[PDB]
Design a protein around this nucleic acid. Structure first.
Ligand code: MG
Ligand code: ZN
Lengths: 56, 283, 112, 1112, 93, 104, 115, 37
DNA sequence: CTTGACAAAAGTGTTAAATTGTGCTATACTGGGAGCTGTCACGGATGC
DNA sequence: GCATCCGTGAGTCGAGGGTAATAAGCACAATTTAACACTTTTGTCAAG
RNA sequence: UCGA
């Protein structure tokens, strides 16, 4: 019960911080909507399929 | 910039800061009224002893009091100990107090609102339901659809006009079979939104076809119960009805639980075999 | 009669507040303890903010929607829908001009 | 019959549970205690401290207080809505100092609410209760420096509001500073007025070596107390010129004044023994001879420097430690408000003395009601610790009274709640239940008093522990506080008791909360019973060791949500504590002496006792409560028979025979059924509704007031101008609903007639009045009609009109009528259900008795729960409850399995073995044999290895039976299930929440006055609120007109909801809205701040959103 | 689900365009009360009721089944909104 | 089907000299089996008068034509000294299970 | 009764610090959406049932009850512009009233609105 | 409380038109009615 | 529909009865008062 | 730049239960409002 | 202060 009930309290607080992050994410990215079919940019980025395992 | 130092102080209309007596012979009023009251009081007294040619000390002090009163009307508690009604701890809520805050006019009375044509209740499993179907309690559904049912009772004989059918439904709940069928005559083809709080994923609200059924409980399909995060320990879910054909179109098309299958988050399926189903199909 | 796509927020001059104001509320009273009617200069006064009853004038000389908008000769109220008491604002003229506390105590104080 | 398991026998019974309410309230009462011998603490403490009053001069002195008899009985106070209280007549004396005029006249103070037998106050007619509080005890404390990695920091703290927190933290430049109420100053300028000069400071300061110079300053070590008294006064309070008498009359109060500084008895005492010193009063310093002394700062600096010198015995003590934390009991809080109120009155005397006629004024003119009576009235009503009693069942209140909260005034708030208060300290143990607590944001904030846990007058909690001398159990039981316990080494109640001596050489024991294997020698103590480690409800859960802490918490918390059932039955397998429960709850009627029953009479149970005098006990049968749950006492005694003292006569709502009964024992089958039990859902046999199982009874209060309006008065009558005859039916004469009538929603309980405020009917309305000629009379119908979603018969009617005896009605109000409406609620579809093991669910589609997964005997199962919830929840207590119940159904005997003492797998399997041996016996004996379907199941059961192959189907079905599994036939088909299904008797509870209440909906109705939005909730009959995140969801779907409608048409829009309603009524499509309302309200609100907010179009030109209203 | 929803989603780029189409068309069907429909007798969506089987009063469904045939036409700024309502409310009462 | 007592306004209100309350007796009222000897009889009424210190039962009712009780040992309610009771019921024949709330 | 003072709408509620007072107060001083269509339906159905009366008497009724200029017209005035005597106007509106009373008992459309 | 910039209220899809064959050809014929006017 | 005679409804003027606003009290009174703690993270203005 | 102080937040819908508290006092002018005597319309009746 |  020592650590268990503690974990209960943990989830309890983090569930409160969840909305804290959520509502702000909404309040920032809200204006984002698909507008143009194509923005018409040459700009891009890559996506490495390989991740380095450190110390290995 | 000199407008920041204000001469004429704007006063909010009576219905915005109401004072009205409730049942029992009581009286109720806004704090903004008391704030304004003390303000104008100090102001008039000020003018009085000012034009009178009173000593500079008292005049100046009165000016200060006028400043802090104006502040009490604008933003209360922004400087020094907030003004409270005599005997009570609770500070008087001013303009700024009303605007800003968790319960402020934006976060409370603007960015979300209480709406007509809606209700809620406890949820129960849907094993007979197919997807877009949902059990909607008879009682709840009738009073929910009352404006529509009135029209369908208008067309379908039984009472001559709207008011007739209205009074017929209100007093004396006979609920003759005629109205049970007429209700379905205005129901079928239209779907109502079902919501489960908290609303996190957009899937927290899904369009479901109302099915008139006994009991006061709301039946929900077991598959989408995963998306809603809901279970039945006695969880409760909301129901709203889209009015205009436009809103109904949006509902039935893109808000439909059947038309939303994959998870908008991961792109992978959202409502899939869960719990029991998996167990049997495994066995 | 026109689409509204734009909303501006700016400072309001004292003259603007004067323009909004239908009168200066002086008497720091609400309603008489008996009549429960808005006091003469009181914060609820009908003679400025408008009638409590729709189209029914304060004193009661004008009543219906027939005569509309015309201020009466007794109480001085206007005959119009009772809804106006929601949208009609007054003003209080200060002897010594005071400051809006927002600009004073704002983090980057604007006056300062 | 009955049966009980377990070895360990409690050597002490559980002391009365209600005591911590009543007894601790008694010490602050001293009602039957003579005015002479009164303890001086509690009520007298708040008295003696507020006296005398001195300010040609006068001194008012205290004598005593009279305890008044209650003006009304506990019953009457409810019906009248009067607080249950009693006049307190205070005795004092007015003494002229110089005049030598001694005038002694006893006076009156006010009314002080008393406590009932169960420990519940009655405020405003509706009985409420005061929960206990928890905060760290006063005195001095020593913690490691939060900032400094080096030495530590001490602290000094009094009772709440009873003095400033005095902190001293050595700053590291090497120097020292002291912080009290946000400020800084060395200790060097403190002790000047404490009797320690330059030399007196540096004497034994060198015992700690390097710490001397910490306190030295040559600037202030020159000057003497009167010179340096004003010095610190220019610092802490520079709100007035630094006068020499101004530091004399100010700083004196913060310490030497016993009033504005009161350090708790517990604080004074504990800090006295922990500092290795002593203290006279409750103050920090003494004021004598114009200078001051020091009993406090010297020892606390002594100990701080000690601990920082690393000397053994002087060390940091834990903050959340239960030895460092005390409890605020009801009486303590009572005195706590009493004293401040009496202080407000104490200054009510001051200004009363300085005016009028100083020559002759009796103390009658010097004493007032208000500064006390209002202070008491403010407490019981509005204090966070004082709230509605839980009447949902006897155990509900019984537990409610034993709860401990760190919240409320004097406590903490959710904003500041950390993992420290939420956690269970190592020393909690048998003092505080580690599990029971809300699952909300209140986790660990509201706990419950553990079973054997007791709180002394000092606030420290202690648990019973039997001492042991050289592996020999001593029958002497000791109550040891947290630190006391921390000293010794306590063994376990489950230790190998060999008959008063220790058996094995490995004994489970701990120190401070640190489990260790200890020899039979070193053990000085052992706990009485493991039950002490858990609270009531938690202790009411059998096989608790097999359930996870979460689900156990949930179950024990749910036992409070329990509702009384008409046929309610005691649990088959219970911990055996249910006996004392219904007793200490005082909900049942027992025998006071050894009597004989003269008559049953389910109103009056009359018994003549051995003393020869007949004492009859009346019954409360079918009466209301706070939760609507009916309070019913069913007489269990025959027309005559002998009754020993303590033996039960009547019953209680949750009581069967004197055992606590929440729900009923039913037959559960663990197996998925047609996806209906999906996700912890519940199916139920229809046969329940026929047997009236899980059927409850609930009543509700409905009150109505007729006042005198400005337009004119009101009255309660049967006469209404437009009413139809058929509705007036059940109203007899005066216009009230008669007893046992039928009231459907919409029907009128009580008629009210009020003169309407008028004006005139509209022209169309007026012409309509002309057609029928019907005149609308002045007075119209205000009648109270029973709200929708509820209704039923009427068990009672309460009529109170002003001018009647014994009843004073509120000013300007003529009549008040209160009807009791009772309903019999039978278990419905979607109703909450649970067991003691923390398994929840609602009712999903009650299935006909026809089709049920029955057994060979043809007896259908009552529930059929879903196994899926079991492994996740990790509660096996329901599995074992079912296993024991399976044997209990046959053997016909209940079982008692205490927490952490009781039945084991072999024993239970034996019970099932016997039960099967009888069952199969009835089978073969009735002229039957093994069913072919049974063979069909036994085959595959044998193939999967569930039963040993080669054995006859007798032995196979036997090996299957004791496993808990049996053969089940599907009622729908009649062919069995492909595998065995564990079934049996499980005790299942019907929870508070029901669909009949929680259901609601709205089309059109009430709107807020401020903004035109509706009013959320069933009460106001409003619509649901659309949350910000619901809005977000709608935005995510990209439904424009849905969200638009939500924000306008159906919510605050003026003509939106109207024109919409008309469009739907006329069969059209609702037009598009214009003005949100509350947006416009927002605009004008902004304008009140002198913010000019204009709505332009596309070209930056102003558009009127107010539609030509305020344009001027 | 709504029969032909995959096809309907396939009929236009954005699903929102489809929604707008169905909405406006259902509106039109409500204005003239089904007498403007492009559907033949066997094509008329029918709701079965104990009293009798009649044409489904729901306009949205009617719009769905309508566009399913593709006998309708849609696009941005197709025709002037002016004459759009003048010859619309004319042809049908 | 249904019952009536002169001292009873509902399923709650207590009868003098009776241990069992109304609905507590009603609990045992539906547990009574009454056979109709007449195939054409859709309705009947049973009469009971029990006073003094006697324990009533099924066999204590007023016997009538075309009706008999298979369990006279079914306990109705205990009555103390002086307790007097007048009861009348009405019995109908039907199929399945119909709740009290469903039938008028 | 006069002694007591009004109660603030900002009054908190119970244990919940968030719950206010004034949000519990309904607005009855503004027409409910049902009342709009109610008064509409009345003013309509009445006008429909009015057309069955003589061109004079039908006008006289709404002139008497103020459905025209919003004000009552005394018999003297209703007769002044019609040239008829006050007594005539009286008998006219009585007769017309009962002639309405015939149709109303039949249709039962306006037999509602009985409050 | 206005139409949300996104969704079906997007300025992209909110200008969509809907016409049935007969009416479409009616207004289509109405074009040549103005060439003689 | 009309003419005259009349009760009741509604008007209009003067007055009795309340309700409401204003003023003054001269022995000498000459700087208030209540305090409340067991957050927490961060971001900016301000001070060393 | 580097410690400190002030300012702003902090989850979603519900369920309920709700409301305490006045120590200046009297004399008189100023209106306001209830009282009341009698007038002019307004509504209703009878007979034409 | 409880329900999810
Ligand atoms: Mg849940
Ligand atoms: Zn006027």
């Amino acid at each position: 019960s020592h650590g268990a009930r503690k974990g209960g309290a943990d989830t309890a607080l983090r569930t409160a911080d969840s909305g804290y992050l959520t509502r702000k994410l909404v309040d920032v990215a809200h204006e984002i909507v698909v507008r143009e079919a194509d923005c018409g940019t040459t700009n891009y980025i890559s996506v490495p399929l390989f991740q380095m395992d450190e110390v290995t | 910039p000199e407008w920041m130092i204000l001469e004429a102080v704007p006063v909010l209309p009576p219905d915005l800061r109401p004072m009205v007596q409730v049942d029992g012979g009581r009286f109720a009023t806004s704090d903004l009224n008391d704030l304004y009251r003390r303000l104008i009081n100090r102001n008039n007294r000020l003018k009085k002893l000012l034009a009178q040619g009173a000593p500079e000390i008292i005049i100046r002090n009165e000016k200060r009091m006028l400043q802090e009163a104006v502040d009490a009307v604008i933003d209360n508690g922004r400087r020094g100990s907030p003004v409270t009604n005599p005997g009570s701890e609770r500070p008087l809520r001013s303009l700024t107090d009303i605007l800003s805050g968790k319960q402020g006019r934006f976060r409370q009375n603007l960015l979300g609102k209480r709406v007509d044509y809606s209700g809620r209740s406890v949820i129960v499993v849907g094993p007979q339901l197919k997807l877009h179907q949902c059990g909607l309690p008879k009682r709840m559904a009738l009073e929910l659809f009352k404006p529509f049912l009135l029209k369908k009772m208008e067309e379908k004989a039984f009472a001559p006009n709207v008011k007739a059918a209205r009074r017929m439904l209100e007093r004396q709940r006979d609920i003759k079979d005629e109205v049970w069928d007429a209700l379905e005559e205005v129901i079928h083809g239209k779907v109502v939104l079902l919501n489960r709080a908290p609303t996190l994923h957009r899937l927290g609200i899904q369009a479901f076809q109302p099915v008139l059924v006994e009991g006061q409980s709301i039946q929900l399909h077991p598959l989408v119960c995963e998306a809603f995060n809901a279970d039945f320990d006695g969880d409760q879910m909301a129901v709203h009805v889209p009015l205009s054909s436009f809103a109904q179109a949006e509902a039935r098309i893109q808000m439909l639980s059947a038309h939303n299958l994959l998870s908008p988050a991961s792109g992978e399926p959202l409502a899939k075999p869960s719990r029991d189903i998996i167990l049997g199909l495994y066995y | 009669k026109k689409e509204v796509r734009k909303v501006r927020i700016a400072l309001a001059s004292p003259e603007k507040i004067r323009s909004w104001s239908y009168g200066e509320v002086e008497k720091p009273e609400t309603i008489n303890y008996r009549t429960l009617k808005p006091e003469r200069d009181g914060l609820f006064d009908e003679r400025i903010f408008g009638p409590i009853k729709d189209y029914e004038c304060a004193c009661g000389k004008y009543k219906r929607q027939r005569f509309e908008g015309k201020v009466c000769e007794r109480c001085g109220v206007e005959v119009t829908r009772s809804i106006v008491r929601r949208y009609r604002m007054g003003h209080i003229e200060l002897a010594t001009p005071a400051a809006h506390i927002w600009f004073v105590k704002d983090v980057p104080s604007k006056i300062g | 019959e009955i049966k009980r398991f377990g070895r360990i026998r409690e050597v002490i019974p559980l002391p009365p549970l209600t005591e911590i309410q009543v007894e601790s309230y008694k010490k602050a009462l001293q009602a039957d205690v003579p005015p002479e011998k009164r303890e001086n603490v509690g009520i007298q403490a708040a008295f003696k401290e507020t006296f005398p009053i001195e300010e040609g001069g006068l001194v008012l002195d205290f004598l005593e207080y009279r305890i008044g008899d209650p003006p009304f009985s506990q019953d009457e106070c409810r019906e009248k809505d009067l607080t249950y209280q009693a006049p307190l007549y205070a005795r004092l004396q007015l003494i002229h100092k110089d005049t030598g005029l001694i005038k002694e006249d006893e006076v009156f103070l006010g009314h002080l609410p008393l406590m009932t037998e169960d420990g519940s106050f009655i405020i405003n007619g509706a009985d409420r209760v005061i929960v206990s509080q928890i905060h760290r005890s006063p005195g001095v404390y020593f913690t490691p420096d939060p900032a400094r990695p080096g030495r530590y920091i001490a602290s000094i703290i009094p009772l709440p509001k009873r003095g400033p927190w005095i902190d001293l933290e050595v700053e590291a430049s090497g120097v020292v500073t002291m912080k009290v109420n946000k400020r800084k100053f060395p200790l060097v300028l403190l002790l000047r007025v404490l009797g320690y000069d330059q030399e007196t400071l540096v004497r034994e300061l060198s015992a700690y070596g390097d710490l001397v110079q910490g306190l030295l300053d040559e600037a202030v070590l020159a000057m003497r107390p009167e010179e340096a008294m004003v010095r610190l006064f220019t610092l802490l309070r520079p709100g007035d010129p630094p006068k020499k008498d101004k530091a004399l009359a100010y700083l004196f109060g913060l310490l030497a004044d016993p009033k504005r500084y009161d350090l708790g008895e517990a604080g004074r005492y504990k800090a006295e023994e922990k500092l290795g010193v002593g203290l006279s009063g409750r103050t920090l310093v003494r004021f004598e001879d114009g200078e001051f002394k020091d009993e406090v700062f010297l020892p606390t600096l002594r100990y701080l420097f000690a601990l920082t010198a690393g000397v053994p015995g002087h060390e940091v003590d834990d903050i959340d430690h239960l030895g460092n934390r005390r409890i605020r009991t009801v009486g303590e809080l009572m005195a706590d408000q009493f004293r401040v109120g009496l202080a407000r009155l104490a200054r009510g005397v001051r200004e009363r003395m300085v005016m009028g006629s100083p020559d002759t004024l009796t103390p009658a003119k010097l004493v007032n009601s208000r500064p006390l009576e209002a202070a008491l009235r403010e407490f019981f009503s509005r204090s966070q610790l004082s709230q509605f009693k839980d009447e949902t069942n006897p155990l509900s209140s019984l537990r409610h009274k034993r709860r401990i909260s760190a919240l409320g005034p004097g406590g903490l708030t959710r904003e500041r709640a950390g993992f420290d208060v939420r956690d269970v300290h190592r020393t909690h143990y048998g003092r505080i239940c580690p599990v029971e607590t809300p699952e909300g944001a209140n986790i660990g904030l509201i706990t419950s008093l553990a079973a054997y846990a007791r709180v002394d007058a000092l606030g420290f909690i202690r648990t019973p522990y039997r001492r042991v001398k050289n592996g020999v159990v001593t029958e002497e039981v000791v109550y040891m506080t947290a630190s006391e316990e921390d000293r010794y080494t306590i063994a376990q109640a489950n230790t190998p008791l060999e008959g008063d001596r220790i058996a094995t050489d490995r004994v489970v024991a701990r120190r401070r909360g640190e489990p260790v294997i200890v020899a039979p020698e070193e053990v000085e103590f052992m706990d009485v019973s493991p039950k002490q480690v858990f609270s009531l409800n938690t202790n009411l859960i059998p096989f608790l060791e097999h359930d996870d802490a979460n689900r156990a918490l949930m179950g024990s918390n749910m036992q409070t949500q329990a509702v009384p059932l008409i046929r309610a039955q005691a649990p088959v397998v219970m911990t055996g504590l249910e006996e004392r429960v219904v007793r200490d709850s005082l909900a049942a009627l027992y025998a006071e002496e050894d009597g004989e029953v003269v008559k049953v009479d389910g109103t009056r149970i009359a018994v003549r006792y051995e003393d020869g005098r007949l004492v009859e006990h009346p019954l409360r049968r079918y009466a209301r409560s706070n939760q609507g749950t009916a309070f019913d006492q069913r007489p269990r005694v025959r027309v005559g028979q002998r009754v020993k003292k303590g033996d039960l006569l009547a019953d209680g709502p949750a009581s069967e025979e004197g055992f606590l009964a929440l729900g009923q024992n039913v037959l559960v089958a663990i197996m998925p059924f047609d996806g209906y039990n999906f996700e912890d859902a519940i199916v139920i046999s229809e046969e329940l509704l026929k047997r009236d199982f899980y059927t409850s009874i609930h009543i509700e209060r409905y009150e109505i007031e007729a006042r005198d309006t400005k337009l004119g008065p009101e009255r309660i009558t049967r006469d209404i101008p437009h009413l139809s005859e058929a509705a007036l039916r059940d109203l007899d004469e005066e216009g009230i609903v008669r007893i046992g009538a039928e009231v459907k929603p919409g029907d009128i309980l009580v008629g009210r007639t009020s003169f309407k405020g008028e004006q005139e009917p509209s022209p169309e309305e007026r012409l309509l009045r002309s057609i029928f000629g019907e005149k609308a009379r002045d007075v119209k119908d205000t009648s109270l009609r029973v709200p929708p979603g509820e209704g039923g018969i009427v068990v009672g009617r309460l009529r109170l009109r002003r001018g009647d005896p014994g009843v004073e009605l509120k000013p300007g109000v003529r009549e008040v009528v209160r009807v009791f409406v009772a309903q019999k609620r039978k278990l419905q579809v979607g109703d909450k259900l649970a067991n003691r093991h923390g398994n929840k669910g609602v009712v999903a589609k009650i299935l006909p008795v026809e089709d049920m997964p029955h057994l060979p005997d043809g007896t259908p199962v009552d529930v059929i729960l879903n196994p899926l919830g079991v492994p996740s929840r990790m509660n096996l207590g329901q599995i074992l409850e079912t296993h024991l119940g399976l044997a209990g159904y046959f053997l016909g005997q209940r079982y008692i399995s205490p927490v952490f003492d009781g039945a084991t797998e072999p024993e239970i399997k034996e019970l099932l073995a016997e039960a099967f041996n009888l069952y199969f016996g009835k089978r073969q004996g009735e002229g039957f044999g093994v069913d072919k379907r049974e063979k069909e199941v036994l085959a595959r059961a044998e193939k999967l290895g569930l039963v040993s192959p080669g054995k006859s189907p007798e032995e196979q079905l036997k090996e299957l039976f004791d496993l808990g599994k049996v053969v089940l036939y599907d009622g729908r088909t009649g062919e069995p299930f492909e595998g065995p299904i564990v079934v049996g008797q499980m005790f299942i509870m019907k929870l508070y929440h029901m669909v009949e209440d929680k259901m609601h909906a709205r089309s059109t109705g009430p709107y807020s006055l401020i903004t035109q939005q509706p009013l959320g909730g069933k009460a106001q009959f409003g619509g649901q609120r659309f949350g910000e995140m619901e809005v977000w969801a709608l935005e995510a779907y990209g439904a424009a007109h849905t969200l638009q409608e939500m924000l306008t048409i159906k919510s605050d829009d003026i003509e939106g909801r109207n024109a919409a309603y008309q469009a739907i009524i006329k069969g059209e499509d609702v037009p598009e809205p214009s003005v949100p309302e509350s947006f416009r309200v927002l605009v004008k609100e902004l304008q009140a701040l002198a913010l000019d907010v204009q709505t332009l179009d596309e070209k930056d030109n102003p558009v009127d959103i107010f539609e030509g209203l305020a344009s001027k | 689900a709504e029969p032909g929803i995959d096809k309907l989603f396939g009929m236009v780029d954005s699903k929102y365009r489809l929604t707008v189409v169905v909405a406006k068309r259902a509106q039109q069907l409500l204005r003239h009360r089904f007498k403007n429909t492009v559907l033949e007798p066997e094509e008329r969506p029918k709701m079965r009721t104990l009293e009798g089987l009649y044409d489904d009063p729901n306009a949205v469904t009617w719009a769905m089944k309508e566009l399913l045939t593709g006998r309708l036409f849609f696009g941005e700024n197709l025709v002037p909104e002016d004459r759009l309502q003048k010859e619309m409310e004319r042809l049908y009462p | 089907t249904s019952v009536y007592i002169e001292d009873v306004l509902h399923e709650f209100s207590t009868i003098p000299g009776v241990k069992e309350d109304v609905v507590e007796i009603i609990l045992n009222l539906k547990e009574l089996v009454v056979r109709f000897l007449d195939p054409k009889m859709a309705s009947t009424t049973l009469i009971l008068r029990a006073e003094g210190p006697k324990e009533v039962r099924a066999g204590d009712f007023t016997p009538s034509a075309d009706v008999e009780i298979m369990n006279p040992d079914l306990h109705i309610a205990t009555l103390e000294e002086g307790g007097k009771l007048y009861m009348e019921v009405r019995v109908d024949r039907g199929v399945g299970y119909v709740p009290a709330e469903r039938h008028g | 009764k006069i002694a007591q003072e009004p109660v603030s709408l900002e009054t908190p509620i119970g244990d919940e610090k968030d719950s206010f007072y004034g949000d519990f107060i309904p607005d009855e001083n503004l027409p409910s959406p049902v009342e709009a269509a109610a008064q509409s339906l009345l003013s309509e159905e009445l006008e429909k049932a009015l057309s069955k009366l003589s061109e004079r008497e039908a006008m006289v009724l709404k002139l008497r009850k103020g459905l025209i200029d919003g004000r009552e017209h005394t018999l003297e005035e209703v007769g002044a512009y019609f040239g008829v005597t006050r007594e005539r106007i009286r008998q006219i509106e009585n007769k017309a009233l009962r002639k309405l009373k015939y149709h109303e008992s039949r249709t039962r459309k306006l037999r509602d609105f009985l409050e | 409380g206005r139409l949300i910039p996104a969704g079906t209220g997007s300025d992209f899809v909110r200008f969509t038109q809907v016409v049935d064959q007969r009416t479409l050809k009616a207004i289509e014929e109405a074009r040549k009615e103005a060439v003689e006017a």
